[PDB]
Amino acid sequence: RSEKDSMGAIDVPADKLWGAQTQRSLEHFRISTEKMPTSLIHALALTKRAAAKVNEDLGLLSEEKASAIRQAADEVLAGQHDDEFPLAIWQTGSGTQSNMNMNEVLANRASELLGGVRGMERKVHPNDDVNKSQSSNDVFPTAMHVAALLALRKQLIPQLKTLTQTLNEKSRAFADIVKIGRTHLQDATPLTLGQEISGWVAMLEHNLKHIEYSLPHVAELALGGTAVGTGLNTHPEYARRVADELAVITCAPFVTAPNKFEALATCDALVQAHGALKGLAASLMKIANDVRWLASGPRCGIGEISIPENEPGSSIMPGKVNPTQCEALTMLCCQVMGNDVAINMGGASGNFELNVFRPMVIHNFLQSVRLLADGMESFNKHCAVGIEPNRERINQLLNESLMLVTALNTHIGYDKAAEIAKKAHKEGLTLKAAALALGYLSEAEFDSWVRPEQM
Amino acid sequence: MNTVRSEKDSMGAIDVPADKLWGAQTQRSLEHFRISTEKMPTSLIHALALTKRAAAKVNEDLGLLSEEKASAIRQAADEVLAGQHDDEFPLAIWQTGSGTQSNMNMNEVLANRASELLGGVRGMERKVHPNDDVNKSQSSNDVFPTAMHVAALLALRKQLIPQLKTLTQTLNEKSRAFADIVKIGRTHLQDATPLTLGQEISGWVAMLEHNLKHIEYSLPHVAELALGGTAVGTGLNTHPEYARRVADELAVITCAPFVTAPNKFEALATCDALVQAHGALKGLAASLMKIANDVRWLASGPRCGIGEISIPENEPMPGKVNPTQCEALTMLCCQVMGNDVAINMGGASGNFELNVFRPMVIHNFLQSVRLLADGMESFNKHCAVGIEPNRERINQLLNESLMLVTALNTHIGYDKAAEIAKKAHKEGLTLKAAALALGYLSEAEFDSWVRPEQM
Amino acid sequence: RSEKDSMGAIDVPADKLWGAQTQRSLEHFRISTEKMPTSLIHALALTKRAAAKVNEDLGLLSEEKASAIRQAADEVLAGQHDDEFPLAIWQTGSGTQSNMNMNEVLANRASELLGGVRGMERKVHPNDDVNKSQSSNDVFPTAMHVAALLALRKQLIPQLKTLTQTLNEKSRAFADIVKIGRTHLQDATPLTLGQEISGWVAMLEHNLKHIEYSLPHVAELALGGTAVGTGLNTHPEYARRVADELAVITCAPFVTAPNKFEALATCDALVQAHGALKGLAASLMKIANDVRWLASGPRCGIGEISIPENEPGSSIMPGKVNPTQCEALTMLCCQVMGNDVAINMGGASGNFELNVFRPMVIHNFLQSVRLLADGMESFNKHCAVGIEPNRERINQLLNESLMLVTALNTHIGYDKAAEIAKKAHKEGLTLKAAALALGYLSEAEFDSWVRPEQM
Amino acid sequence: MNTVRSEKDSMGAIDVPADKLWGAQTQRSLEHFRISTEKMPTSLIHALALTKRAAAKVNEDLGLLSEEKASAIRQAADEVLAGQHDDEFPLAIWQTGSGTQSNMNMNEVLANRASELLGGVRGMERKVHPNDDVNKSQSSNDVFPTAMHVAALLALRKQLIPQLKTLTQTLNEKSRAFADIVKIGRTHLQDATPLTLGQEISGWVAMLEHNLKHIEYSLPHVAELALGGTAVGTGLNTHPEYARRVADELAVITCAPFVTAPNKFEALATCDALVQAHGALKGLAASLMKIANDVRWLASGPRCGIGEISIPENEPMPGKVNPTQCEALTMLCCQVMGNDVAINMGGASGNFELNVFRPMVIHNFLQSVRLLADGMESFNKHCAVGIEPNRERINQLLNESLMLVTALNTHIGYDKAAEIAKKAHKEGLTLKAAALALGYLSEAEFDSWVRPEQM
Ligand SMILES: O=C(O)c1cc(C(=O)O)c(C(=O)O)cc1C(=O)O
Ligand SMILES: O=C(O)c1cc(C(=O)O)c(C(=O)O)cc1C(=O)O
Ligand SMILES: O=C(O)c1cc(C(=O)O)c(C(=O)O)cc1C(=O)O
Ligand SMILES: O=C(O)c1cc(C(=O)O)c(C(=O)O)cc1C(=O)O
């Protein structure tokens, strides 16, 4: 088919709904393989849908066109036009290409929906109709916040709660299992496995509130700011109304940004929101490491806990259960850390009225959310729910450490108690064996004094 | 002073300069960790002293310390706080990851000094003891983390925040003052639709206001103190009311809302509160970077740049005024960005019951606070308060741009307006010149029609 | 179809060539959307091909099977089986899943090629045949280096040279155009546009040698190290031979790693090689920024150069040419910076005999190469080749700056010359206008003294 | 000293402490940039002095400076180098991005001191002048970059490299010593096939050897000096032989292969050489992090960890030996990682003819060199030289593992061997116990067949 724009005409694949501007970009921005993610495409479609409704309400668009555009939008949301967005993330910094991609796809489809044809003889026009009362400048940032807030609310937060609930049950289930504490990787005083796990729980609980604190700023929308933030060429009620419409159809508390200049010139809300995410990544990294070290073995590591074997193993090598879910989680955590740096440089690089590092910022942000959400779900289902204590190993280690000598101090002078600890350590004996051989006490009184369950 | 004093510890005797208040352990660390030049920050030292001062008071209250010994330790700490012993802490940041060595440094200095205060002498025949008295009811494991938060919270509340509010106020005043000044907008570095200088500056204001909220949201997690958790978090070897009492004392003497950490395992095993708080700081750094850049580009020139504004020339090519304050600010913003990565790595590396990357983490965190607070204070007083518009240059730019043709649309139609824009662009003429050459309107009409103030 | 392994049987989609282990992973590692990139799949196929050949040579594999496997491998290289590798990057840290994915696909296809069927009744066995004399431990790292070295040699380096050649021609073409230099964004002494561009050229030339210095370490292969690096269960000549085979079929100087322990336990070669890449990213970022700032305008920026308008523009807004290729390049540069951090954390996180952060490291590495290579190509073709000087603007600015007063010093006292500079600056006049009004000289002698083309 | 001295510059007169050698400009910077506590590194100060010393000699050689004045400046610099004026440089790192203020600091100190050396007095009636004499034939723009490379190259060659070679030698000796000690391998933290301790350590050796080469490859770019490029790189206002001559002088007095930069525009506009050199350093940091971690995990215990090796206990829970040197090393490795990001951001931010992020960049670079050099020196002398194997623990681990069953295959077949492994694993028995319980072999046969030394 032959589609055209100001620069003239250009042939586009007949079976496609996109136009000339999308085709040119497809030839000018052939960089790597990353394209806009589905969540962003949906957010962009939702933004066009709400814009169509409000424009209709203000009498700027005919009902016939308004409804057709919204219908084409719903088809995108339904997953009917995934193959219609071939543009790379590495395009113009404002995301203008992707805005045009949606305008053309929506206009062409909306034409067909009105008994028309796709292309040059279309009834609905991409710029004049679909992009009415908008600008690439304020539409893309809006799409970014819609996608981000929805991903955080719908995917990340629920998965975070679920994982916490599981670990919380585990904490309670193992509340009485006393184990040897470790600081600097060295044997220290005892604590219960339940207490150790409760530490992971509190970490996740704290992260949740931190992530929630970032939502309000992300809920602010640029729509209405127009080209530079002044709102020139828009109805005074447009910005507030469109924010309302979007809130209504997504069930999220979106609001119009109090300052459009800040909304257009920066990616601050995302730079901040992502800070909470890298915070979550550091916490998960620690939890994952504890799990895999505690399950290390089966014979030459710590082996205090056991996790489910998900992958098939060698017949001649029973016991080697690699903590794959832990390896997948730690890897994605490193990724979030890196994504943060990319976002920071982009967020700090805005100039004057517009920050033009947007596609890259949203690409990294959405990926982090995806990684963290799916990562917690997988870790939860394929590992966390199955954490079980190797009670024997736990006790063996507890009764093998010299750390329990403390209980004896209250019943025998610091030096005498420490005296048996020196012998046990030196001779390679256990505290009891050394205590009995040194004749400092009897088995009966020893056992009654060294009460690990009493801290 | 060449004269030494023989001090001793569990490992034996070692020589310490006679004129110094530290002991055996501090001397060993000093000789074992000769790494680089970074030592503990003055703020951290003072926080450690405040912690010991509070621990003493409460130990006295619980009758664990003799009133005389307690008051002595308390008085010695106050001298540290008054800046009388800044030279008594020579340990490098690069020491044991728990900060144990610096805890001992404070214990030894406080003991040797309290001894003298009790009519005693410093050294191995001191009246007050480092471990038995000064470190009573505490652990290196829970003391350092506590000092970290005390220092962090106070620096944020007393240094960072006040400076942020001040810069914000200044920019807000500038915003109101230049509200009527219309200038050319710039998107993608290209000329764009007009906006007032006041509106552009209001964007910086909103950025700073948003940053304040984010910083405020990170405070309650930092206010949580680990004191009471002892070695592994269980609180073994501590009076049940200690944690709460010591946290209350701290709150009282600092006037900061400190509270004991609900979960001590999370407090000892991680630096999560700081990883998250620093996330807000790197956010402020990204915003500051953008503001500083806008300021220097807008003041670039004097003849071959943008030159829309003028900034105070603070140092000794006639009109060549380098934006030095802007250069210091952008440089420190990059530092905060790198500091975030160092903090993230340390935060994600906790193992079991204790995170041993603490000195490095607090070192980077407190540096970022100093950099941001002082940077904003400097930028504000040496640049921000004196920003002035170059009204003539601004107006010259507006009248030379092709972006004002939009005002002609309603009078002569879009087609003729676009023709004028094209002519002016192709022939290197101003909009008025092109309009007149074509004869589409009179100069009087142009002057009455194109009013940039109605953008 | 029903495929099975040690854990039992599992149904796999009939029209697919993968087996049970791939199907289980597909259900256990449902994280995000990133899969192994084509270049890595090819490298893995090439590794299996070379392994099959050598195994045949050493008499470990029958000619019938050896040749069939190599044939199945060539089909993968031919792009016939892209849809056969559905595994996510976020899998087991050693890349075992992906190794099994290739073994199963290759075994199944190799069976069909031998008149057999795919599945349980296959003639060629994934583990026993395709993975003969190998381990997931030494195969994945080998695939990583093959993919990395080939991407650097075949894609990155050629694009780097091409871009340099173009800029080099430009430097030469503009060798005589004198322009105003800028330091701190302020007007400074003059230099030619050719000189400024030659700076970009030297930057690229230096980067090339830096990238070349990293190749030798990347050329070292782990194959032969087997499970822990000892080479247990392998023929002594295996490692060297397979390295040779791989060198032969790829035409790259691959060699067997001198130390297999270093090869297995770390990702050091990549951490180092990537360091050169982030170095290249910082250089490109600077070059891209200079281009877009120099082309800023058309009327209110610098506008010293003009670049090609690739995207269609508004009829009523001629002149607004957004530097899109520059925006795409700067965005991907920020990405490489972030990718480096992720790679660093992964490369630093190895434990004992094996680094298990591999899939994430190679994912980031290959993406950086792709971004940089395609980024330079696009920047070159759609921008660099079209850089043209706006000679008029350049001269206007040159004859408008006060910087030329220096030429007068040699003909008139420092103070007198500076005297006219003060007037020009203060009155807003040009150096000549001020010089003539101040009566310090005549137009003739002025023009003969102020020779900008003589530096 | 309360007494002041009146010094003056183009901006006027200002009071300087009478007891100090600096001047008016240094005093203004001191009062305008009160930011944080970081000042120029001693190494950088000395490099700046070396640069001025060389500039003087060559200026004398070209008859641009009077022999008397030249020798005086030269003698004053030597005092700085001898450490006699460390207190004369109070300027913060956070100053003008070109490092102009610190250049002036050295000019003023050198002038005031050279004056006295000529029988003159310091102050506004000095015999030697800061700008006219000490800064002769130079520019702040080309002097600071030069000082940066002098400092960088010397620190790498005299501090970093020697320490690296020393640690490598030590580890190599340990490798040869423990060559016969067979231990259990670990992949994914799980027990794996055996390897000798010497082989595991040889991996650390090869890592360090590879790092040395990478570091060496980055040196020639750092050896390139910008001196001669002047303000914008053209070399305007300089004797044609200056650049080469001054570079030769520097080379002679330092014995380092310094050479003038072939392209001065690349030298002034970027910090590329340092961005690249630091890339090799972050690589060494990742390797060191892995080695330090291996060491601390391998020494973990004494009863509930791995405990395969023992390290020197350097400071004053009997056998509880914290791996403090390991903790300092890992902490500083995270610092180098963050420093790389700060350096990258500054390196990527050059604008036109000059990069004004220099102080921050050199600050981070020299800190990384200090950290790595001192860290390796400390780790080597306080840990590495004393690493000893716990032969009994090692052997206990081997005999308790299921990984040795492989040796039975050739004698009793794979099926029976796997059965023994399964039995032992399910019932918590050693391989010998399971083998004997089944009656598949005699204890004598087990002892003769399973020889871990033949792994
Ligand atoms: O990226 C573009 O080319 C662009 C697109 C639009 C739009 O979609 O309408 C607008 C606008 O009219 O607001 C402005 C710009 C711009 O350059 O700033
Ligand atoms: O670094 C130390 O050596 C240390 C010191 C103390 C202390 O404060 O005395 C304690 C404690 O009893 O809480 C714990 C440790 C430890 O190693 O975990
Ligand atoms: O990841 C695995 O499950 C794995 C796979 C293989 C293999 O492909 O053969 C081997 C090997 O025999 O070398 C070892 C391991 C391991 O755990 O280290
Ligand atoms: O920072 C400065 O003020 C400065 C100082 C000098 C100098 O060394 O005197 C020069 C020079 O002539 O090379 C350039 C500059 C500049 O602003 O670009």
Q: What is the 3-state secondary structure (H, E, C) of chain B?
A: CCCEEEEEECCEEEEEECCCCCCHHHHHHHHHCCCCCCECCHHHHHHHHHHHHHHHHHHHHCCCCCHHHHHHHHHHHHHHHCCCCHHHCCCECCCCCCCHHHHHHHHHHHHHHHHHHCCCCCCCCCCCCHHHHHCCCCCHHHHHHHHHHHHHHHHHHHHHHHHHHHHHHHHHHHHHHCCCCEEEEEECCEEEEEEEHHHHHHHHHHHHHHHHHHHHHHHHHHCEECCCCCCCCCCCCCCCCHHHHHHHHHHHHHCCCCEECCCHHHHHHCCHHHHHHHHHHHHHHHHHHHHHHHHHHHCCCCCCCCCCEECCCCCCCCCCCCCHHHHHHHHHHHHHHHHHHHHHHHHCCCECCECCCHHHHHHHHHHHHHHHHHHHHHHHHHCHHHCEECHHHHHHHHHHCCCCHHHHHHHHCHHHHHHHHHHHHHHCCCHHHHHHHHCCCCHHHHHHHCCHHHC
Q: In sequence order, which residues have a C-beta less than 8 Å from that of residue C125 and are 6 or more positions away?
A: C107
Nearest CA to ligand 1 atom 10: A135
Closest CA to A106 of A147, A66, A72: A72
How far is the C-alpha of D28 from the C-alpha of A19, rounded, in Å? 61
Please tell me whether residue A2 adopts helix, strand or coil conformation. strand
Q: How far is CA A309 from the centre of its chain?
A: 26
How far is the C-alpha of A89 from the C-alpha of A93, rounded, in Å? 9
Closest CA to D346 of A337, C337, A340, B361: C337
How far is the C-alpha of A225 from the C-alpha of A61, rounded, in Å? 20
Q: Yes or no: is domain D139-403 CATH 1.20.200.10?
A: yes
Q: Which helix (H) or strand (E) holds A445?
A: helix A443-449
Detail the DSSP E strand segments found in A147-265.
178-183, 186-192, 220-221, 255-256
Q: Answer whether B367's CB lies under 8 Å from B153's CB.
A: no
Q: In sequence order, which residues have a C-beta less than 8 Å from that of residue D400 and are 6 or more positions away?
A: A299, A300, D430
CA atoms within 13 A on the CB side of B17: 9
Burial class of residue B244 in the structure, from the number of CB atoms within 10 Å of its CB (0-12 exposed, 13-18 middle, 19+ buried): middle
How far is the C-alpha of A441 from the C-alpha of D82, rounded, in Å? 67
Q: Which residue has the tokens 């963290």?
A: A372
Both tokens of D331, joined, read 């902490």
> What is the whole-number distance in angstroms between the Cα of residue A290 and the centre of ligand 3?
23
Class assignment of domain D404-454? mainly alpha
How far is the C-alpha of D196 from the C-alpha of D174, rounded, in Å? 12
Q: How far is CA A380 from the centre of its chain?
A: 15
User: Cα torsion at B188, B192, B198, B201 (round to 10°)?
Assistant: 0
How far is the C-alpha of A180 from the C-alpha of A193, rounded, in Å? 9
D120-145 burial, b at 16+ Cβ within 10 Å, e below that, comes to bebeeebbbbbeebbbbbbbbbbbbb
Q: Answer whether D280's CB lies under 8 Å from C277's CB.
A: no
> What is the whole-number distance in angstroms between the Cα of residue B100 and the centre of ligand 2?
7
Both tokens of C128, joined, read 């026993």
Selecting from D191, D303, D400 the residue whose C-beta is nearest the C-beta of A187 gives D303
Check if A314 is active-site.
Answer: yes
Within chain B, all domains assigned CATH 1.10.275.10 are found at 4-138
Q: Which residue has the tokens 């480096």?
A: C340
Within chain B, all domains assigned CATH 1.10.40.30 are found at 404-454
Q: Answer whether C91's CB lies under 8 Å from C363's CB.
A: no
Q: In sequence order, which residues have a C-beta less than 8 Å from that of residue A291 and are 6 or more positions away?
A: A305, A307, A323, A326, A383, A387
User: Active-site residues of C: which are they?
Assistant: 184, 314
Cis, peptide link before residue B323, omega less than 30° from 0? no
3-state SS track over chain C: CEEEECCEEEECCCCCCCCHHHHHHHHHCCCCCCECCHHHHHHHHHHHHHHHHHHHHCCCCCHHHHHHHHHHHHHHHCCCCHHHCCCECCCCCCCHHHHHHHHHHHHHHHHHHCCCCCCCCCCCCHHHHHCCCCCHHHHHHHHHHHHHHHHHHHHHHHHHHHHHHHHHHHHHHCCCCEEEEEECCEEEEEEEHHHHHHHHHHHHHHHHHHHHHHHHHHCEECCCCCCCCCCCCCCCCHHHHHHHHHHHHHCCCCEECCCHHHHHHCCHHHHHHHHHHHHHHHHHHHHHHHHHHHCCCCCCCCCCEECCCCCCCCCCCCCCCCCHHHHHHHHHHHHHHHHHHHHHHHHHCCECCECCCHHHHHHHHHHHHHHHHHHHHHHHHHCHHHCEECHHHHHHHHCCCHHHHHHHHCCCCHHHHHHHHHHHHHHCCCHHHHHHHCCCCCHHHHHHHCCHHHC
**DSSP code at position A389:** E
Task: Kindly determine whether residue A187 and residue D305, on different chains, have CB atoms separated by under 8 Å.
Answer: yes
Closest CA to B452 of B388, B389, B396: B396
A:D CB pairs within 8 Å: 119
Quickly count: other Cβ atoms within 10 Å of residue D426's Cβ.
Answer: 11
Q: In sequence order, which residues have a C-beta less than 8 Å from that of residue D122 and are 6 or more positions away?
A: D5, D21, D112, D113, D115, D116
Q: How far is CA C341 from the centre of its chain?
A: 16
Q: Answer whether B165's CB lies under 8 Å from B208's CB.
A: no
How far is the C-alpha of C332 from the C-alpha of C326, rounded, in Å? 10
Q: Which residue has the tokens 């929805």?
A: A150
Burial class of residue C79 in the structure, from the number of CB atoms within 10 Å of its CB (0-12 exposed, 13-18 middle, 19+ buried): exposed
Closest CA to D272 of C287, B113, C42: C287
How far is the C-alpha of A243 from the C-alpha of A260, rounded, in Å? 13
In angstroms, the first-to-last Cα distance of chain D is 75
Q: In sequence order, which residues have a C-beta less than 8 Å from that of residue A11 and are 6 or more positions away?
A: A1, A2, A3, A23
Q: Which of B188, B210, B239, B411 is catalytic?
A: B188
Q: Answer whether A412's CB lies under 8 Å from A196's CB.
A: no
Q: Answer whether B36's CB lies under 8 Å from B23's CB.
A: no
Sign of the dihedral through C-alpha A415, A418, A424, A425? negative
How far is the C-alpha of A359 from the C-alpha of C108, rounded, in Å? 41
Both tokens of B266, joined, read 């999370």
How far is the C-alpha of C111 from the C-alpha of D132, rounded, in Å? 85
Burial class of residue D175 in the structure, from the number of CB atoms within 10 Å of its CB (0-12 exposed, 13-18 middle, 19+ buried): buried
Within chain D, all domains assigned CATH 1.20.200.10 are found at 139-403
CA distance readout (Å), C172 to C165, C169, C175, C176, C452: 11, 5, 5, 9, 19
CATH code linked to domain D4-138: 1.10.275.10
Tell me the β-bridge partners of A305. A389
Quickly count: other Cβ atoms within 10 Å of residue C409's Cβ.
Answer: 14
CA triple A36-C377-C322, angle to 5 deg: 65
CA triple D210-D213-D215, angle to 5 deg: 110
> What is the whole-number distance in angstroms between the Cα of residue B141 and the centre of ligand 2?
6
Sign of the dihedral through C-alpha A182, A183, A188, A194? negative
Quickly count: other Cβ atoms within 10 Å of residue D443's Cβ.
Answer: 11
Tell me the β-bridge partners of B310. B388
Closest CA to C427 of C402, C445, C448: C402
> What is the whole-number distance in angstroms between the Cα of residue D246 and the centre of ligand 4?
19
Q: Which helix (H) or strand (E) holds A65?
A: helix A63-77
Q: Answer whether C438's CB lies under 8 Å from C423's CB.
A: yes
Q: Answer whether D275's CB lies under 8 Å from D343's CB.
A: yes
Q: Which CATH number fits domain A1-134: 1.10.275.10, 1.10.3720.10, 3.40.50.9100, 3.30.420.40?
A: 1.10.275.10
Q: In sequence order, which residues have a C-beta less than 8 Å from that of residue D444 and are 6 or more positions away?
A: none
Tell me the β-bridge partners of C389. C305
D240-249 burial, b at 16+ Cβ within 10 Å, e below that, comes to eebbebbbbb
CA distance readout (Å), A275 to A347, B214, B276, B292, C389: 12, 10, 7, 22, 43
Burial class of residue C455 in the structure, from the number of CB atoms within 10 Å of its CB (0-12 exposed, 13-18 middle, 19+ buried): middle
**DSSP code at position A252:** S
CA triple A355-A358-A359, angle to 5 deg: 155
Please tell me whether residue A253 adopts helix, strand or coil conformation. coil
Both tokens of B141, joined, read 């494991």
Q: Which CATH number fits domain C135-403: 3.20.20.100, 1.20.200.10, 3.40.50.280, 3.20.20.140?
A: 1.20.200.10
Ramachandran category for residue B279: left, alpha or beta (phi over 0 → left; psi -120 to 50 → alpha): alpha
Burial class of residue C65 in the structure, from the number of CB atoms within 10 Å of its CB (0-12 exposed, 13-18 middle, 19+ buried): buried
Q: Answer whether B46's CB lies under 8 Å from B151's CB.
A: yes
Helix B197-222 crosses helix A193-218 at what angle (to 10 degrees)?
Answer: 170
Q: Which alpha helices (H) appear in A385-441, and where do they start and end? A: 391-398, 405-409, 414-427, 431-437
Q: Which helix (H) or strand (E) holds D6?
A: strand D4-9
Both tokens of B345, joined, read 């790595």
Q: Which residue has the tokens 């710029």?
A: A127
Check if B188 is active-site.
Answer: yes
User: Cα torsion at D242, D246, D248, D254 (round to 10°)?
Assistant: 180
Q: How far is CA A24 from the centre of its chain?
A: 34
> What is the least distance, in Å, from the CA of C79 to any CA of chain D?
33
Experimental technique used to determine this entry: X-ray
Burial class of residue C205 in the structure, from the number of CB atoms within 10 Å of its CB (0-12 exposed, 13-18 middle, 19+ buried): middle
Q: Answer whether B180's CB lies under 8 Å from B85's CB.
A: no
**DSSP code at position D13:** E
How far is the C-alpha of D343 from the C-alpha of B361, rounded, in Å? 19
Both tokens of D394, joined, read 């090692």
A73-106 burial, b at 16+ Cβ within 10 Å, e below that, comes to bebbeeeebeebbebbbbbbbbbbbbbbbbbbbb
Quickly count: other Cβ atoms within 10 Å of residue A64's Cβ.
Answer: 14
CA atoms within 13 A on the CB side of C390: 20
Selecting from D320, D321, D402 the residue whose C-beta is nearest the C-beta of A299 gives D402
Q: Which residue out of A6, A100, A137 has the highest number of ligand 1 atoms within 8 Å of its CB and is therefore the one to mutate? A: A137
Segment 346-385 of chain A within 8 Å of chain B by CB: 347-356
Both tokens of B35, joined, read 């790494």
Would an 8 Å CB–CB cutoff place C229 in contact with chain D?
A: yes
Q: Answer whether C281's CB lies under 8 Å from C333's CB.
A: yes
Both tokens of B122, joined, read 């410093």
Q: Which residue has the tokens 């916040």?
A: A145
How far is the C-alpha of A347 from the C-alpha of B336, rounded, in Å? 14
Sign of the dihedral through C-alpha C398, C400, C401, C403? positive
Architecture field, domain C404-455: Orthogonal Bundle (1.10)
Q: Which of D188, D214, D221, D363 is catalytic?
A: D188
- Chain A residues touching residue B276 (CB < 8 angstroms): 206-207, 210, 275-276, 279
Ramachandran category for residue A13: left, alpha or beta (phi over 0 → left; psi -120 to 50 → alpha): beta
CB of B98 shorter than 6 A to ligand 2? yes
Q: Are strands C178-183 and C186-192 parallel, antiparallel or unpaired?
A: antiparallel
CA distance readout (Å), B130 to B9, B23, C128, C405: 11, 9, 66, 71
Which amino acid belongs to residue A431? L
In angstroms, the first-to-last Cα distance of chain A is 79
Q: In sequence order, which residues have a C-beta less than 8 Å from that of residue B84 and are 6 or more positions away?
A: none
Q: Which residue out of D141, D232, D354 has the highest number of ligand 4 atoms within 8 Å of its CB and is therefore the one to mutate? A: D141
Please tell me whether residue D123 adopts helix, strand or coil conformation. coil
Which amino acid belongs to residue A383? C
Task: Kindly determine whether residue B342 and residue D335, on different chains, have CB atoms separated by under 8 Å.
Answer: yes
User: Cα torsion at D297, D298, D301, D302 (round to 10°)?
Assistant: -160
Both tokens of C415, joined, read 């103070």
In angstroms, the first-to-last Cα distance of chain B is 75
Within chain A, all domains assigned CATH 1.20.200.10 are found at 135-403
Both tokens of B359, joined, read 């000195």
Within chain A, all domains assigned CATH 1.10.275.10 are found at 1-134
Task: Kindly determine whether residue D97 and residue B337, on different chains, have CB atoms separated by under 8 Å.
Answer: no
CB of A101 shorter than 6 A to ligand 1? no
Selecting from D195, D217, D341 the residue whose C-beta is nearest the C-beta of C228 gives D195
B191-205 burial, b at 16+ Cβ within 10 Å, e below that, comes to bbbbbbbbbbbbbbb
Q: Answer whether C316's CB lies under 8 Å from C224's CB.
A: no
B93-124 burial, b at 16+ Cβ within 10 Å, e below that, comes to bbbbbbbbbbbbbbbbbbbbbbbbbbebebee
> What is the least distance, in Å, from the CA of A26 to any CA of chain D?
28
The rounded radius of gyration (Å) of the Cα atoms in chain C is 30
How far is the C-alpha of B329 from the C-alpha of D95, rounded, in Å? 9
How far is the C-alpha of C52 from the C-alpha of D187, rounded, in Å? 26
Q: What are phi and psi of C83, to 5 degrees?
A: -70, 0
